[PDB]
Structure 1
Amino acid sequence: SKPFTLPILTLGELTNSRFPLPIDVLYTNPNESAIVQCQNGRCTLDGELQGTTQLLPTGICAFRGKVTQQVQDEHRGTHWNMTVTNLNGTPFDPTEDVPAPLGTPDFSGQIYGVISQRNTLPANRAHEAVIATYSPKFTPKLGNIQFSTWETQDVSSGQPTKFTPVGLASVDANSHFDQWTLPSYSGALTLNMNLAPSVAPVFPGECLLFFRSFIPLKGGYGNPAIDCLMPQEWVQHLYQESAPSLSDVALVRYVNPETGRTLFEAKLHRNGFLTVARNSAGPVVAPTNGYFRFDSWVNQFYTLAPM
């Protein structure tokens, strides 16, 4: 039976699976009231990608498609309707068992990035853009979304278009940033489907352990973060290896390789998430050389050493 492994990568060698950002810190928040059911960075320990998860770091929160119409906002700015395809350019088939095109953002907010176009030597243009994933017009599962620009005219219809994500536009009240609220992939009156399951601790005194990244802002006040369940390199590694899961919970140890000492241990659950025995919120303070190593398979009743 092919032994289960994790890559050997410090935090400073990992990237977020929910937005294109380096991992900054490990993080807990036991009092979280929201259901945690993110759709990017979802992979079982035996290498089954779930939700909208795909392998490319460049595909996370990306879109490809073509613009079809300009629609002026009532007050300021300009909106553009965009038909979206799969990231590989093939038509998105809404009958496939996925929530939305792979890579689609998995949270409510105003996602800031750049729209670029290369016409079918060709002409090109790029501009800053914002995608409001809570908008009624955000319907990627139906094959269409809308983005807005500060630029008022120089976006072409019927030409190949790329969205490269950069950060958030705002985290003000009216910008509806909530990293645990899913978009309505087909619009507000329709249920999302084919979702990766929600995740939670099941044992008293445990809480989720996240890989946290701070996300840039176009403007305003804030220090927003995006928390993923596993970094993108772990998704990539599990997919490659596809090791059989020998129980429902792996025990992993966060080790300092210089000293050989274990700093703490965590449960790595079959569906692809970590819990720890910690009763506080905030960053985990740990040496920069540290990383997780698989120890053994255990079960739901295993008691983790407190942090």
Structure 2
Amino acid sequence: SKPFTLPILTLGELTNSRFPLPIDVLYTNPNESAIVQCQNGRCTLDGELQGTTQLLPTGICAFRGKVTQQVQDEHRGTHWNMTVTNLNGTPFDPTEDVPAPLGTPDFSGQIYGVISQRNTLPANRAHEAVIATYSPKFTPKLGNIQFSTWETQDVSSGQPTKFTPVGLASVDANSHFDQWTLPSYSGALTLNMNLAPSVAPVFPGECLLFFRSFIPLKGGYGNPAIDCLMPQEWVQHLYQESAPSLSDVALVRYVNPETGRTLFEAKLHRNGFLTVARNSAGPVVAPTNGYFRFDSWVNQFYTLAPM
């Protein structure tokens, strides 16, 4: 049986699977009331990608497509309707068993980035843009979204268009940032489909452990973060290896290689997420040289050493 492994990458060598950001800290929040059911950075321990998860770091919260129409918003700014394809350029087939094109953002908010176009030497243009994923016009599962620009006219219809995500536009009350609220991929009255399952601890005293990244803001006050269940390099590693899962729960140790000492241990669950025995919220303070090492297969009743 092909032995299970994790990459040997320290926190400072890992990136977020839910937004193109480095991992900044490990993080817990035991009193979280939301159902945690993110769709990017989802991969089983035996290498099955789930939700909208794909392998490219460049594909996370990316879109590819063509602009079809300009619409002016009542207040301020210009909106552009965009028909989206798969990230590899092939037509998105809504009948495929995915929630949305792979790479589609998996949270409610105003995602800030750059729209760029290269016409079919060709002419080019790029502008700052915002995609409101909570918008009724955000319907990637139906093959179309809307983005807004400060630019009022210089966006071309019928030309190949790329969205490069950069951060959030805002996290103020009216910007509906909630990292655990899924978009309605087909619009507000339609049920999301083919989702990666929710994740949660099942053992008393345990809480989820997240890989946290701080995300840039176009403006306003805030220090927003995006928490992923596993970094993108773990998704890539699990996918490559496809090691059989020998129980539902792997025991992993967070080790300081310079001392060889275990800093803490965690459960790595079959569906691809971590729990720890910790009764507090906040970052995990751990040496920079640290990384997770697979120890053994255990079960749901294994008692983790308290952090």
Smaller-chain TM-score bracket:
over 0.9
Gaps of 5+ in 1: none
The superposition leaves residues 81-124 of structure 1 with CA deviations (integer Å, 9 ceiling, x where unpaired) of 00000000000000000000000000000000000000000000
The superposition leaves residues 134-164 of structure 1 with CA deviations (integer Å, 9 ceiling, x where unpaired) of 0000000000000000000000000000000
SS in 1 for 2:233: helix
Distance 1:77 1:29 in 2: 37
1:282 Cα deviation from its structure 2 partner: 0.0
Distance 1:77 1:98 in 2: 32
1:28 Cα deviation from its structure 2 partner: 0.1
1:299 Cα deviation from its structure 2 partner: 0.1
Distance 2:181 2:53 in 1: 17
Distance 2:241 2:2 in 1: 8
1:294 Cα deviation from its structure 2 partner: 0.1
SS in 1 for 2:254: strand
Consecutive aligned runs of 4 or more in structure 1 exceeding 2 Å deviation = none
SS in 2 for 1:174: helix
SS in 2 for 1:233: helix
The superposition leaves residues 190-227 of structure 1 with CA deviations (integer Å, 9 ceiling, x where unpaired) of 00000000000000000000000000000000000000
Distance 1:79 1:213 in 2: 29
Distance 2:243 2:43 in 1: 12
Distance 2:69 2:162 in 1: 16
Distance 1:215 1:266 in 2: 26
The superposition leaves residues 236-278 of structure 1 with CA deviations (integer Å, 9 ceiling, x where unpaired) of 0000000000000000000000100000000000000000000
Distance 1:278 1:24 in 2: 19
The superposition leaves residues 51-87 of structure 1 with CA deviations (integer Å, 9 ceiling, x where unpaired) of 0000000000000000000000001110000000000
In structure 1, the residue matched to 2:178 is 178
Alignment of 1:264-275 (within 5 A): 264-275=264-275
Distance 1:197 1:222 in 2: 30
Distance 1:230 1:57 in 2: 13
Distance 2:185 2:76 in 1: 26
SS in 1 for 2:117: strand
Distance 1:258 1:224 in 2: 32
Distance 1:255 1:88 in 2: 38
Gaps of 5+ in 2: none
SS in 2 for 1:114: strand
The superposition leaves residues 7-40 of structure 1 with CA deviations (integer Å, 9 ceiling, x where unpaired) of 0000000000000000000000000000000000
Distance 2:91 2:294 in 1: 40
Count residues in correspondence: 307
In structure 2, the residue matched to 1:282 is 282
Distance 1:59 1:189 in 2: 27
Q: CA RMSD in A?
A: 0.2
Distance 1:203 1:75 in 2: 50
Distance 1:153 1:259 in 2: 59
SS in 2 for 1:71: strand
Distance 2:14 2:257 in 1: 17
TM-score normalised according to structure 1 size = 1.00
In structure 2, the residue matched to 1:190 is 190
SS in 1 for 2:197: coil
TM-score normalised according to structure 2 size = 1.00
Distance 1:209 1:128 in 2: 34
In structure 1, the residue matched to 2:233 is 233
